[model samples]
Target: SITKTELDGILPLVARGKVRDIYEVDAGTLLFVATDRISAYDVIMENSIPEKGILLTKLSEFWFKFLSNDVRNHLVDIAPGKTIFDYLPAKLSEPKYKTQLEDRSLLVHKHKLIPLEVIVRGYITGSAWKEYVKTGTVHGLKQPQGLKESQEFPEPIFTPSTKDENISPAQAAELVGEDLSRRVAELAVKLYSKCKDYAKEKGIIIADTKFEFGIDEKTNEIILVDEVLTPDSSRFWNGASYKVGESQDSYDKQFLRDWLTANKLNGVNGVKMPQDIVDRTRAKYIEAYETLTGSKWSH
Candidate 1:
């Protein structure tokens, strides 16, 4: 059983990602701990994004509730230290690692997360547009005759892709077309449609959101796993100014992403961001948290 203090035990054997630490407990169950760490552009950088862990966990918790009527989640409980009220579960699971440790949270559930990243996009932008220009359209879905950058789609689209941890593989045609591809594709589309409508009513542009699912034995259904649409899972733009041409001013971590990427392109490292940028970015993150959940983040 992995607990918060079991860091020394974990760092040595477990697999850590940009955001979470996953540990294998047995064949069926895994221990997932949310950490404050964040990554951008596939690069894990130096600075720790403030409130990231709690934010991600909280947002995912909110999404779990948001999608509860349509999907099943496998959350157990929150770790100590993160005493959040805004996005906490109205109900929690049996305490698995009772401890004085604060900050770390527990998410134990099915081990086999479906090998696909279910993404739904309301507008044409980001990698979706980048791919469109390359192949005449994205994910085999034809775009409007002359869709410009950031144009709103006639309808929200489901453009699924495997979460390739590495670069592309051209040899395996199945990489983008064939058996496992179509199955995951359908799952991504259905899951996205369900969540997109919910997000729109919330006054958010689910610009795109990612969902992971796992096979459940008891019901033999693919259950939603991991986090859903926090700023981390999806890009949330303010629905009011959501236009089609340029990036909308988002109340998201995009502030940091934009700043960091700009500096990186200009050759600045992550030791620190410009002071005003840091302060403003922090406030932006807090603002997004407050707006989306209708609950302020105090602490």
Candidate 2:
């Protein structure tokens, strides 16, 4: 399982995100390589999960294609008989470097990204549940009374957030203008609603998911940017055993989170997860990928 990547100066390193090592492929394109590094409570674990990055990359690619007809994304199209390596620096094609990239890398076009974590929720849970219980509101918006924990909302709602705080749609508008916020909200809800139904049929429940968008400066169109609907970006609940009024088993990092909390390791940096936790989390990620895409995971 690869964790940190070393490219040996073949490409300019852009930014090292919590789970991705981004590189500048060109002025207009970037390479997003998902590493197996797992994080819980905003802290990255020391040991990496095997093929976790591959699962995330494959799942994101699946959703990008699934939603291609509805919206534009940042993925660069590879021509037939060619691969992503064809667009990257030739030096990276060497086996030593190619092994690190292979199935976990994406070639994406760059654009001016809208500065907001555009989140949509189909159920009342997580921070929303905590807020609702305290103030009868979610992201400062009132909800119907008697909403139980993990209960489905009357309909999906847009709840955007900045880096620090969750903001109402109106506040989101104030930050990114009314027009852009309205467009993002409508599009996010539509995307979530459609995908939620599809995921339910596949025996996974997409309770909520976050989306990132960028603008096409030339056409003024919103392009869905960043990773979409991966376990790391969304809550995947087990549909077969789902029950309202309680937190359900999730396909993401809940197991890791629980293990951390149990061992008093939440938010502690450079910590290594137990072997059992790693295996369990890996299985959950693979399960989510196969269950949603209806394709078996390989390599």
Candidate 3:
């Protein structure tokens, strides 16, 4: 994509997500760009969600604000660069080669992210249901007998798993011991409580979410990393449709996953994504985003 031979200055890409391109600006600084590629059913969808990048960025910022009283996060500012670029008014490139200038991204303070994926869930679904149905429990937290799929728990539970490329909720529970599990569980609840309360006010119920944390080099203090409580990490459910006896309807992902499960491709081994499914699923992501954030989406 680089067309400029004169463009000798370039940094190495540090990390890449389905919708993000991250670069290490320095030892403790990062430039994370939120893209529009929205994934559904654990499968990266075919189309890009409108304003999906912007919505996730703002939502992460909201989480940083919500948890500021309890923890420190790397999202100190939105971006050093402006969205409106004067260089390329129309686009990065049209019928030519493209290069570095990007929009719908951020320049964030970087740190050593804590090596744990914190999952906080109140309702049983997804992996929770899969594990619960198999072993009558999800991970180390033993549950009482007879809990329906997607049934609301009396309170949210903290389900600490691993940070490996392949993470298993049930098997990974052993690493996080009794005290650590309790703390993670507590922090997960607190974090989810804050996000869920705020989302409800915004007309969205945060069913569950995951968080990535980092540590301050100078203070050795725990810090939050990446996006927080966004649709990518959290499942949003319509407040009106939640019922105790049945599976709570998700405002996101279920449509695509249902398709995958219907085809017996529900992450058993892999997925075969088609065009029609991709377009509809992408539209679904944008719809959920607009409804929750009340902001129109665009690339």
| lDDT of each candidate versus the true structure | 0.59, 0.93, 0.64
Q: Residue by residue across 1-299, what tens digits does model 2's lDDT show?
A: 98999999889999999899999988899999999999888789999999999999999999999999999999999999999999988889999999999999999999987999999999999899999999999999988999999999999999999976999999999999999999999999999999999999998999999999999979999999999998889888888899998888766788888899999988999899889999999998888889888899874
What is the RMSD, in Å, between candidate 3 and the native fold over all Cα? 5.6
RMSD of each: 6.4, 1.3, 5.6
Q: Count the backbone clashes (under 3 Å) in each candidate.
A: 2, 0, 2
- By lDDT, the better pick of 1 and 2 is 2
Candidate 1 lDDT, tens digit per residue, 113-207?
Answer: 55656666767777878877787576666677677766767766656557652112222124433554455445556666666676667677777
- Best candidate, TM-score-wise? 2
What is residue 53's positional error in candidate 3, in angstroms?
Answer: 1.7
Clashes of 3: 2
- Residues 110-167 of candidate 3 have per-residue lDDT tens digits of 6764567887887777787887888887764678888987777778876765753324
Top lDDT model: 2
